[PDB]
Amino acid sequence: QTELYEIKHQILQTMGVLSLQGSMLSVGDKVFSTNGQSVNFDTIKEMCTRAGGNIAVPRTPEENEAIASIAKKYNNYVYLGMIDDFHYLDGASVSYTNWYPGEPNGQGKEDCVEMYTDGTWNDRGCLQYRLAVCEF
Amino acid sequence: QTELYEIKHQILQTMGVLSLQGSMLSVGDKVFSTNGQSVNFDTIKEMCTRAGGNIAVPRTPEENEAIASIAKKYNNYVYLGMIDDFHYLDGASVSYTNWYPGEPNGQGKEDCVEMYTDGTWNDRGCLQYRLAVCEF
Amino acid sequence: QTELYEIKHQILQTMGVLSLQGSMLSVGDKVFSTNGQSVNFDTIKEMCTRAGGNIAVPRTPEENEAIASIAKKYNNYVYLGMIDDFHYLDGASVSYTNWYPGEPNGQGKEDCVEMYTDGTWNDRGCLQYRLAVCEF
Ligand SMILES: O[C@H]1[C@H](O)[C@@H](O)[C@H](O)[C@@H](O)[C@H]1O
Numbered sequence: 001q002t003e004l005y006e007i008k009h010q011i012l013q014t015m016g017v018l019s020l021q022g023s024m025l026s027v028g029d030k031v032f033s034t035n036g037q038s039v040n041f042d043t044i045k046e047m048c049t050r051a052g053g054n055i056a057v058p059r060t061p062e063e064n065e066a067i068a069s070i071a072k073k074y075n076n077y078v079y080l081g082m083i084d085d086f087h088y089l090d091g092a093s094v095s096y097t098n099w100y101p102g103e104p105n106g107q108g109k110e111d112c113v114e115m116y117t118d119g120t121w122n123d124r125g126c127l128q129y130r131l132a133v134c135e136f
Numbered sequence: 137q138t139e140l141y142e143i144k145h146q147i148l149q150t151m152g153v154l155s156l157q158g159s160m161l162s163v164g165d166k167v168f169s170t171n172g173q174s175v176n177f178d179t180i181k182e183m184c185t186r187a188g189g190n191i192a193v194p195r196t197p198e199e200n201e202a203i204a205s206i207a208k209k210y211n212n213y214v215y216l217g218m219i220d221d222f223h224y225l226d227g228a229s230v231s232y233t234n235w236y237p238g239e240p241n242g243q244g245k246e247d248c249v250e251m252y253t254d255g256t257w258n259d260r261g262c263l264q265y266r267l268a269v270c271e272f
Numbered sequence: 273q274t275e276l277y278e279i280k281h282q283i284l285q286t287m288g289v290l291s292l293q294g295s296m297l298s299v300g301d302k303v304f305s306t307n308g309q310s311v312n313f314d315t316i317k318e319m320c321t322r323a324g325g326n327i328a329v330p331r332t333p334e335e336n337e338a339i340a341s342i343a344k345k346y347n348n349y350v351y352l353g354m355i356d357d358f359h360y361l362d363g364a365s366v367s368y369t370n371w372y373p374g375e376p377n378g379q380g381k382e383d384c385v386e387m388y389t390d391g392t393w394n395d396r397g398c399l400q401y402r403l404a405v406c407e408f
């Protein structure tokens with residue numbers, strides 16, 4: 001009983017501190033974070049995996065708003081965890097989308113997806129330097 | 137048994153890291169933190185709430201010293217969680233006080249309380265930009 | 273059951289965020305961290321203790337690589353938790369070593385141990401300013 005309450009309180013304290021610092025954003029069960037570095041898609045995947053997480057992907061409008069707020073705050077385009085019928089990296093077809101008007105427009109050439117600072121998406125090649133955002 | 141020990145150890149590790157980084161200060165059951173931003177009283181309240189916490193207030197001399205050390209380290213005055221008979225934001229009358237000599241002196245005009253870098257207090261209007269310190 | 277799973281997941285989320293931020297490095301049960309400050313040996317010990325940890329020491333090749341990566345990333349020599357037969361600060365004789373060629377060479381004069389950015393060690397006096405690395 002009391003053991004568990006203190007434990008839960010301390011966890012919420014640490015998450016509160018991280019949230020206040022701008023080191024994380026929590027949406028439901030998901031936690032999004034960036035260290036502010038920009039690298040290509042594969043390198044973001046490697047960085048996220050190294051930390052025990054995955055490259056971020058928005059599966060809901062609230063998750064999209066959260067990642068967009070990161071893009072806007074750090075002022076850079078962001079690579080999302082999807083790959084060209086776009087799929088999540090787990091192999092499932094993407095449900096929620098937020099394409100910029102006219103996108104996706106690069107079938108066969110643009111396999112990745114970047115998010116603009118306004119939260120909309122563009123299919124893009126995977127070799128640009130983009131803000132690394134992970135989800136845990 | 138062992139499940140709980142590992143969990144507790146990991147929590148203390150994360151708190152240790154945050155403490156070392158200067159991202160938190162722990163006094164008893166309370167954790168104080170700032171992100172170094174300066175905004176007005178209402179905006180600090182909004183920032184703290186957003187992170188799952190509350191604007192910091194010292195209820196003990198040790199808590200006062202902790203928040204003072206934050207004010208001194210970030211070198212800015214700090215708004216405290218009290219409002220003019222001063223009350224905590226939970227509605228209770230303030231017990232512990234540490235007024236600068238001659239304060240409070242602004243009844244009816246100065247509804248907020250700021251802490252100086254030496255840890256003493258002054259009643260002040262609520263519309264200055266002050267270091268945002270939260271408690272969790 | 274479910275209580276514990278959610279707790280464990282949240283802990284791993286916070287550790288993931290800290291890892292991504294570069295605020296910690298995890299090797300087995302140990303967590304290494306620096307705040308980037310440089311001070312002398314005693315002062316590092318005081319800083320680590322204050323945070324609830326201890327000055328870092330590598331007891332395995334993997335731990336050595338981890339601390340070396342911190343030295344390399346922050347680009348400074350690091351004081352290790354050992355003191356001249358070198359002993360850990362717990363009083364036990366050091367097992368794993370990684371001396372730079374020709375070291376240790378300062379018996380009676382060089383009581384501390386610093387790590388270079390390439391991960392090798394040198395016995396040194398204790399009064400230099402070195403990157404503070406703690407272990408939790
Ligand atoms: O992905 C492409 C590409 O980035 C082009 O540079 C741009 O002009 C297009 O609008 C966009 O669809």
Ligand SMILES: O[C@H]1[C@H](O)[C@@H](O)[C@H](O)[C@@H](O)[C@H]1O
Nearest residue numbers: 239241242246258259260261
């Ligand atoms: O709150 C007031 C105000 O800040 C005045 O500027 C100052 O001169 C007073 O000493 C103080 O009590």
Ligand SMILES: O[C@H]1[C@H](O)[C@@H](O)[C@H](O)[C@@H](O)[C@H]1O
Nearest residue numbers: 375377378382394395396397
């Ligand atoms: O510890 C000593 C010391 O740092 C000297 O400055 C250096 O030239 C030696 O090589 C080293 O062993």
Ligand SMILES: [Ca+2]
Nearest residue numbers: 106107110123
């Ligand atoms: Ca495409």
Ligand SMILES: [Ca+2]
Nearest residue numbers: 105106122123
């Ligand atoms: Ca496109």
Ligand SMILES: [Ca+2]
Nearest residue numbers: 242243246259
């Ligand atoms: Ca007043």
Ligand SMILES: [Ca+2]
Nearest residue numbers: 241242258259
């Ligand atoms: Ca006053």
Ligand SMILES: [Ca+2]
Nearest residue numbers: 378379382395
């Ligand atoms: Ca020696």
Ligand SMILES: [Ca+2]
Nearest residue numbers: 377378394395
């Ligand atoms: Ca030497």
Ligand SMILES: [Cl-]
Nearest residue numbers: 125126127128
């Ligand atoms: Cl490209």
Ligand SMILES: [Cl-]
Nearest residue numbers: 261262263264
């Ligand atoms: Cl004012």
Ligand SMILES: [Cl-]
Nearest residue numbers: 397398399400
């Ligand atoms: Cl020295």
